Protein backbone atom coordinates (compact mmCIF):
# COMPACT_ATOMS: atom_id res chain seq x y z
CA UNK A 1 0.00 0.00 0.00
CA UNK A 2 0.96 3.63 -0.53
CA UNK A 3 0.27 6.19 2.21
CA UNK A 4 -0.63 9.88 2.06
CA UNK A 5 -0.74 12.39 4.94
CA UNK A 6 -0.90 16.17 5.14
CA UNK A 7 -1.78 19.05 7.43
CA UNK A 8 -0.03 17.84 10.59
CA UNK A 9 1.06 21.44 11.44
CA UNK A 10 3.76 20.14 13.76
CA UNK A 11 5.01 22.63 16.36
CA UNK A 12 6.74 22.74 19.76
CA UNK A 13 3.51 23.75 21.52
CA UNK A 14 1.59 20.66 20.32
CA UNK A 15 3.67 17.71 21.57
CA UNK A 16 0.73 15.27 21.33
CA UNK A 17 0.63 15.63 17.53
CA UNK A 18 4.38 15.06 17.36
CA UNK A 19 4.09 11.92 19.50
CA UNK A 20 1.27 10.69 17.27
CA UNK A 21 3.34 11.26 14.14
CA UNK A 22 6.37 9.51 15.66
CA UNK A 23 4.19 6.48 16.47
CA UNK A 24 2.84 6.51 12.89
CA UNK A 25 6.41 6.58 11.51
CA UNK A 26 7.55 3.71 13.74
CA UNK A 27 4.56 1.51 12.99
CA UNK A 28 2.25 1.98 10.03
CA UNK A 29 4.74 3.74 7.76
CA UNK A 30 7.25 0.88 7.99
CA UNK A 31 4.86 -1.48 6.15
CA UNK A 32 4.22 0.94 3.27
CA UNK A 33 5.50 0.87 -0.30
CA UNK A 34 5.98 4.66 -0.02
CA UNK A 35 4.90 7.62 2.09
CA UNK A 36 3.82 10.94 0.55
CA UNK A 37 3.45 14.07 2.70
CA UNK A 38 1.24 16.54 0.83
CA UNK A 39 2.28 19.73 2.58
CA UNK A 40 1.79 21.52 5.91
CA UNK A 41 3.96 19.01 7.72
CA UNK A 42 5.11 21.92 9.91
CA UNK A 43 3.03 24.84 11.21
CA UNK A 44 5.81 27.24 10.17
CA UNK A 45 9.15 27.24 8.36
CA UNK A 46 11.63 30.10 8.06
CA UNK A 47 14.50 28.18 6.42
CA UNK A 48 16.55 25.00 6.76
CA UNK A 49 19.20 26.68 8.97
CA UNK A 50 16.69 27.02 11.84
CA UNK A 51 18.09 25.17 14.91
CA UNK A 52 14.57 24.33 16.22
CA UNK A 53 15.14 20.89 17.86
CA UNK A 54 11.78 19.62 16.60
CA UNK A 55 13.10 19.86 13.04
CA UNK A 56 15.99 17.48 13.77
CA UNK A 57 13.73 15.14 15.78
CA UNK A 58 11.33 14.89 12.84
CA UNK A 59 14.14 14.57 10.27
CA UNK A 60 15.68 11.67 12.21
CA UNK A 61 12.34 9.87 12.49
CA UNK A 62 11.57 10.22 8.77
CA UNK A 63 15.13 9.19 7.91
CA UNK A 64 14.62 5.97 9.87
CA UNK A 65 11.59 5.16 7.68
CA UNK A 66 13.62 5.82 4.51
CA UNK A 67 16.50 3.69 5.85
CA UNK A 68 13.96 0.90 6.54
CA UNK A 69 13.25 0.74 2.80
CA UNK A 70 10.24 3.09 2.48
CA UNK A 71 10.81 6.07 0.14
CA UNK A 72 9.34 9.29 1.50
CA UNK A 73 8.22 12.27 -0.60
CA UNK A 74 7.15 15.83 0.19
CA UNK A 75 5.05 18.43 -1.60
CA UNK A 76 5.12 21.90 -0.02
CA UNK A 77 2.17 23.39 1.84
CA UNK A 78 1.35 27.05 2.36
CA UNK A 79 2.76 26.87 5.91
CA UNK A 80 6.06 25.15 5.06
CA UNK A 81 6.87 26.35 1.52
CA UNK A 82 10.44 27.23 2.57
CA UNK A 83 11.43 23.60 3.30
CA UNK A 84 14.52 23.05 1.20
CA UNK A 85 17.15 20.60 0.04
CA UNK A 86 19.17 20.75 3.27
CA UNK A 87 16.15 19.47 5.20
CA UNK A 88 15.52 16.95 2.40
CA UNK A 89 19.04 15.62 2.97
CA UNK A 90 18.64 15.53 6.77
CA UNK A 91 15.33 13.65 6.55
CA UNK A 92 15.99 11.50 3.47
CA UNK A 93 12.82 12.86 1.88
CA UNK A 94 12.57 13.65 -1.81
CA UNK A 95 11.08 17.05 -2.66
CA UNK A 96 8.40 16.99 -5.37
CA UNK A 97 6.75 19.69 -7.51
CA UNK A 98 3.45 21.38 -6.68
CA UNK A 99 1.59 18.82 -8.86
CA UNK A 100 2.69 15.23 -9.49
CA UNK A 101 1.04 12.38 -11.40
CA UNK A 102 1.65 8.94 -9.81
CA UNK A 103 1.17 5.37 -11.02
CA UNK A 104 -0.37 3.60 -8.01
CA UNK A 105 -0.85 -0.08 -8.87
CA UNK A 106 -2.01 0.87 -12.38
CA UNK A 107 -4.22 3.78 -11.23
CA UNK A 108 -2.98 7.22 -12.32
CA UNK A 109 -3.39 9.69 -9.43
CA UNK A 110 -2.75 13.45 -9.22
CA UNK A 111 -1.38 14.74 -5.89
CA UNK A 112 -1.00 18.33 -4.64
CA UNK A 113 -1.32 20.28 -1.41
CA UNK A 114 -4.63 21.74 -2.63
CA UNK A 115 -4.28 25.47 -2.01
CA UNK A 116 -3.82 26.18 -5.73
CA UNK A 117 -7.32 24.77 -6.32
CA UNK A 118 -8.85 27.55 -4.19
CA UNK A 119 -9.13 29.96 -7.12
CA UNK A 120 -12.01 31.89 -5.54
CA UNK A 121 -9.53 33.45 -3.06
CA UNK A 122 -7.59 35.70 -5.42
CA UNK A 123 -6.08 37.61 -2.50
CA UNK A 124 -4.52 34.42 -1.17
CA UNK A 125 -3.30 33.43 -4.63
CA UNK A 126 -1.55 36.80 -5.03
CA UNK A 127 0.18 36.40 -1.65
CA UNK A 128 1.16 32.87 -2.69
CA UNK A 129 2.60 34.19 -5.98
CA UNK A 130 4.78 36.65 -4.07
CA UNK A 131 6.22 34.23 -1.50
CA UNK A 132 6.90 31.68 -4.26
CA UNK A 133 8.92 34.22 -6.26
CA UNK A 134 12.56 33.01 -6.11
CA UNK A 135 14.20 36.41 -5.64
CA UNK A 136 11.84 37.16 -2.76
CA UNK A 137 12.60 33.83 -1.09
CA UNK A 138 16.32 34.49 -1.53
CA UNK A 139 16.11 37.91 0.13
CA UNK A 140 14.05 36.56 3.04
CA UNK A 141 16.39 33.61 3.58
CA UNK A 142 19.36 36.03 3.59
CA UNK A 143 18.00 37.83 6.67
CA UNK A 144 19.51 36.77 10.03
CA UNK A 145 17.64 33.93 11.70
CA UNK A 146 16.58 36.07 14.66
CA UNK A 147 15.02 38.61 12.25
CA UNK A 148 13.18 35.87 10.36
CA UNK A 149 11.83 34.52 13.66
CA UNK A 150 10.52 37.97 14.60
CA UNK A 151 8.86 38.40 11.20
CA UNK A 152 7.16 35.01 11.48
CA UNK A 153 5.99 35.56 15.06
CA UNK A 154 4.67 38.98 14.12
CA UNK A 155 2.75 37.59 11.13
CA UNK A 156 1.07 35.09 13.49
CA UNK A 157 -10.74 27.88 5.66
CA UNK A 158 -11.28 28.39 1.93
CA UNK A 159 -12.56 25.45 -0.12
CA UNK A 160 -11.70 24.36 -3.64
CA UNK A 161 -13.22 25.79 -6.79
CA UNK A 162 -15.03 22.91 -8.56
CA UNK A 163 -13.94 24.01 -12.05
CA UNK A 164 -10.30 24.30 -10.95
CA UNK A 165 -10.56 20.66 -9.85
CA UNK A 166 -11.88 19.54 -13.24
CA UNK A 167 -9.24 21.62 -15.03
CA UNK A 168 -6.40 20.08 -13.02
CA UNK A 169 -7.68 16.52 -13.51
CA UNK A 170 -8.09 17.03 -17.24
CA UNK A 171 -4.66 18.67 -17.57
CA UNK A 172 -3.17 15.48 -16.08
CA UNK A 173 -5.80 13.10 -17.59
CA UNK A 174 -6.47 11.36 -14.26
CA UNK A 175 -9.64 10.07 -12.61
CA UNK A 176 -8.18 10.33 -9.07
CA UNK A 177 -6.92 13.32 -7.09
CA UNK A 178 -5.60 13.39 -3.50
CA UNK A 179 -4.98 16.67 -1.68
CA UNK A 180 -5.10 18.40 1.67
CA UNK A 181 -5.21 22.10 2.69
CA UNK A 182 -8.99 22.37 3.14
CA UNK A 183 -9.06 20.24 6.32
CA UNK A 184 -12.36 18.62 5.19
CA UNK A 185 -11.68 14.88 4.89
CA UNK A 186 -14.04 13.48 2.26
CA UNK A 187 -14.36 11.63 -1.03
CA UNK A 188 -16.02 13.65 -3.80
CA UNK A 189 -17.36 12.25 -7.07
CA UNK A 190 -17.15 14.43 -10.19
CA UNK A 191 -16.67 14.01 -13.95
CA UNK A 192 -13.36 14.48 -15.74
CA UNK A 193 -12.11 13.35 -19.16
CA UNK A 194 -15.61 12.10 -19.93
CA UNK A 195 -15.60 9.54 -17.09
CA UNK A 196 -16.41 9.44 -13.37
CA UNK A 197 -13.61 10.90 -11.25
CA UNK A 198 -12.90 11.22 -7.52
CA UNK A 199 -11.28 13.83 -5.28
CA UNK A 200 -10.02 12.50 -1.93
CA UNK A 201 -9.26 15.03 0.82
CA UNK A 202 -6.98 14.41 3.82
CA UNK A 203 -7.77 15.54 7.36
CA UNK A 204 -5.72 17.82 9.57
CA UNK A 205 -4.20 16.21 12.67
CA UNK A 206 -6.21 17.90 15.39
CA UNK A 207 -7.42 15.34 17.92
CA UNK A 208 -6.58 12.21 15.90
CA UNK A 209 -4.58 11.31 12.82
CA UNK A 210 -5.73 10.95 9.21
CA UNK A 211 -4.23 9.16 6.21
CA UNK A 212 -5.19 7.94 2.73
CA UNK A 213 -4.10 4.39 1.92
CA UNK A 214 -4.09 3.34 -1.74
CA UNK A 215 -3.94 -0.40 -2.50
CA UNK A 216 -4.31 -2.33 -5.79
CA UNK A 217 -7.93 -2.95 -4.78
CA UNK A 218 -9.28 0.23 -3.18
CA UNK A 219 -8.76 3.73 -1.77
CA UNK A 220 -9.06 4.18 2.02
CA UNK A 221 -9.51 7.35 4.08
CA UNK A 222 -8.49 6.31 7.57
CA UNK A 223 -8.76 8.00 10.96
CA UNK A 224 -6.72 6.70 13.87
CA UNK A 225 -5.63 7.78 17.36
CA UNK A 226 -2.30 9.45 18.10
CA UNK A 227 -1.27 6.99 20.83
CA UNK A 228 -1.75 3.34 21.71
CA UNK A 229 -5.14 3.42 23.45
CA UNK A 230 -4.82 0.59 25.96
CA UNK A 231 -8.10 -1.15 26.65
CA UNK A 232 -9.27 -1.25 30.24
CA UNK A 233 -12.40 -2.36 31.93
CA UNK A 234 -15.03 -0.95 34.29
Ligand SMILES: O=C(CCCCCNC(=O)Nc1ccc(S(=O)(=O)N2CCN(c3cc(Cl)cc(C(F)(F)F)c3)CC2)cc1)NO
Pocket residue numbers: 007040043044045046078079080082124130131132136137140151152153155156157180181182183
Ligand atom coordinates in the same frame (compact mmCIF):
# COMPACT_ATOMS: atom_id res chain seq x y z
O1 LIG B 1 -3.02 25.24 7.40
C1 LIG B 1 -3.49 25.99 6.58
C2 LIG B 1 -3.51 27.51 6.79
C3 LIG B 1 -4.72 28.22 6.17
C4 LIG B 1 -4.30 29.04 4.95
C5 LIG B 1 -3.66 30.38 5.36
C6 LIG B 1 -2.79 30.94 4.22
N1 LIG B 1 -1.89 31.90 4.81
C7 LIG B 1 -0.63 31.44 5.35
O2 LIG B 1 -0.37 30.28 5.28
N2 LIG B 1 0.29 32.40 5.96
C8 LIG B 1 1.58 32.07 6.56
C9 LIG B 1 2.04 32.90 7.57
C10 LIG B 1 3.25 32.64 8.17
C11 LIG B 1 3.98 31.53 7.75
S1 LIG B 1 5.56 31.25 8.52
O3 LIG B 1 5.51 31.68 9.91
O4 LIG B 1 5.96 29.85 8.39
N3 LIG B 1 6.64 32.17 7.63
C12 LIG B 1 6.84 31.73 6.26
C13 LIG B 1 7.98 32.49 5.61
N4 LIG B 1 7.69 33.92 5.70
C14 LIG B 1 8.05 34.79 4.64
C15 LIG B 1 8.56 34.25 3.49
C16 LIG B 1 8.91 35.08 2.45
CL1 LIG B 1 9.56 34.34 0.99
C17 LIG B 1 8.76 36.46 2.57
C18 LIG B 1 8.26 36.97 3.75
C19 LIG B 1 8.08 38.48 3.92
F1 LIG B 1 6.77 38.72 4.14
F2 LIG B 1 8.79 38.90 5.01
F3 LIG B 1 8.54 39.12 2.82
C20 LIG B 1 7.88 36.16 4.80
C21 LIG B 1 7.55 34.39 7.06
C22 LIG B 1 6.43 33.61 7.72
C23 LIG B 1 3.55 30.70 6.73
C24 LIG B 1 2.32 30.99 6.14
N5 LIG B 1 -4.05 25.44 5.36
O5 LIG B 1 -4.03 24.04 5.16
Ligand SMILES: [Mn+2]
Pocket residue numbers: 007009040077181183204
Ligand atom coordinates in the same frame (compact mmCIF):
# COMPACT_ATOMS: atom_id res chain seq x y z
MN1 LIG C 1 -3.13 22.87 6.66
Ligand SMILES: [Mn+2]
Pocket residue numbers: 040077078079113115180181182
Ligand atom coordinates in the same frame (compact mmCIF):
# COMPACT_ATOMS: atom_id res chain seq x y z
MN1 LIG D 1 -2.51 24.49 3.75
